[PDB]
């Protein structure tokens, strides 16, 4: 094989936990095994631009551990609702 | 009296006026033509001017303000706006 150094061969909560541990030093295990997410609102907003209407997906989610810790998160993505919800989950964990 | 302004979107002079130094060649030419009008054409009384003209126009016949930059740089500091 010709695998470049720093590359690997060829879930969402796991990626949120890893990214937020790298970015803020929070515990990934706590995020993955003790937080529950619940989307609250999921919308399609739109902006008028000279080249037409650009639609974005908006997600407001809440996360918590049922033990006095709660956080709201908002995410926004022009491509997929998965991405907006991922960003909302990220934001919610950051706002605990 | 002091007239303080409201918070402005900018502090800019529309058309800043600059130091247009007059060309020496044109001044010499005007003096020489005045001399010829008064003392006659090809007069010897200002041949020096002719010489000087010839010396100054020989190679070339003809021989920006920064207020907006400093105004934009300093507006927030001097405007006396109350604290946030």
């Amino acid at each position: 094989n010709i695998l470049p150094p720093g590359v690997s061969l060829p879930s969402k909560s796991a990626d949120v936990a890893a990214g937020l541990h790298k970015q803020t030093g929070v515990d990934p295990d706590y995020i993955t095994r003790k937080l529950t997410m619940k989307p609250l609102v999921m919308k399609r907003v739109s902006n008028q631009t000279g080249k037409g209407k650009i639609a974005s997906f908006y997600a407001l989610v809440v996360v918590g551990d049922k033990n006095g810790m709660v956080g709201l998160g908002e995410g926004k993505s022009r491509e997929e609702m998965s991405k907006a919800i991922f960003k909302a989950h990220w934001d919610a964990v950051r706002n605990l | 009296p002091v007239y303080r302004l409201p918070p402005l979107p900018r502090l800019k002079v529309k058309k800043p006026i600059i130091r247009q130094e007059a060309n020496k060649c044109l001044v010499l030419m005007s003096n020489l033509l005045q001399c010829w009008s008064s003392y006659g054409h090809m007069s010897p009384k200002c041949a020096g001017l002719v010489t000087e003209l010839k010396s100054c126009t020989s190679e070339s016949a003809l021989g920006k303000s920064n207020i907006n930059y400093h105004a934009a740089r300093l507006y927030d500091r001097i405007n006396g706006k109350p604290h946030d």
Binding site: P39, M42, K43, R44, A55, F57, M81 | -
Partner: protein
């Protein structure tokens, strides 16, 4: 725009919709009667008319066709001496000794007044089933019903293709071949736009010059679809 003006002027005088299934040229009411002489060989709906001129300006009516006719006129000296220089001789962003002018036009005659003519028009409208002039028909086979050549004919070895406004009210494509007839092909090989074609042809089909003619709440659906899909993702 000019063609649209003539088309409307033709329509209002004639009222094609008020005399359906009436082929040929009979003077038409508007004691008053009037008939189209030229350029139209019929009095039905003009095949090229799309009501609004602005449709030509769009990017979907760029293939639209309109009825105009061309002529060449020698430039007099004063014209030649006028169009000179950066004003009238350059491209605003070889010369000729003639100008090609485009124009649309229309000609009507008013009938006479007489007990003969009146009852004649009534009887000819009543008991004359001139018949559905089908594609390929020459109508009366006179000047008044001969097809109208409205495009430059395509002349290839042994066959000439003409785009006609036919007396059948329609837009026709006629091919005249040598093998069909030497004489008629000889005549067709000299025909030009603006003539009247007085002879039959072998292939006579429906012309596609009117193709881009017949083709001349969603916000709420987008909103509801957006909300439904957004609640469906979950």
């Amino acid at each position: 725009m000019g063609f649209e003006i003539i088309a409307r002027a033709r329509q209002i005088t004639l009222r094609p919709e008020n005399f359906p299934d009436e082929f040929g040229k009979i003077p038409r009411p508007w004691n008053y009667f009037l008939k189209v002489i030229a350029p139209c060989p019929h009095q039905r709906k003009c095949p090229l008319q799309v009501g609004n001129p602005n449709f030509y300006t769009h990017k979907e009516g760029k293939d639209l066709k309109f009825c105009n006719f061309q002529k060449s006129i020698k430039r007099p000296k004063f014209s030649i001496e006028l169009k000179k220089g950066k004003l009238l001789a350059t491209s605003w962003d070889n010369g000729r000794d003639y100008e090609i002018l485009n124009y649309s036009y229309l000609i009507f005659e008013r009938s006479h007044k007489d007990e003969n003519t009146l009852k004649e028009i009534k009887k000819l409208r009543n008991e004359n089933v001139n018949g559905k002039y089908d594609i390929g028909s020459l109508g009366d086979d006179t000047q008044n019903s001969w097809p109208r050549i409205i495009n430059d004919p395509v002349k290839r070895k042994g066959h000439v293709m003409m785009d006609l406004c036919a007396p059948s009210g329609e837009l026709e494509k006629w091919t005249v071949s040598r093998s069909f007839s030497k004489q008629i092909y000889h005549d067709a090989r000299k025909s030009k736009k603006g003539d009247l074609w007085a002879s039959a042809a072998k292939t006579q089909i429906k012309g596609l010059g009117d193709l881009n003619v017949k083709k001349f709440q969603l916000k709420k659906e987008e909103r509801q679809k957006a909300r439904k899909a957004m609640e469906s993702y979950n």
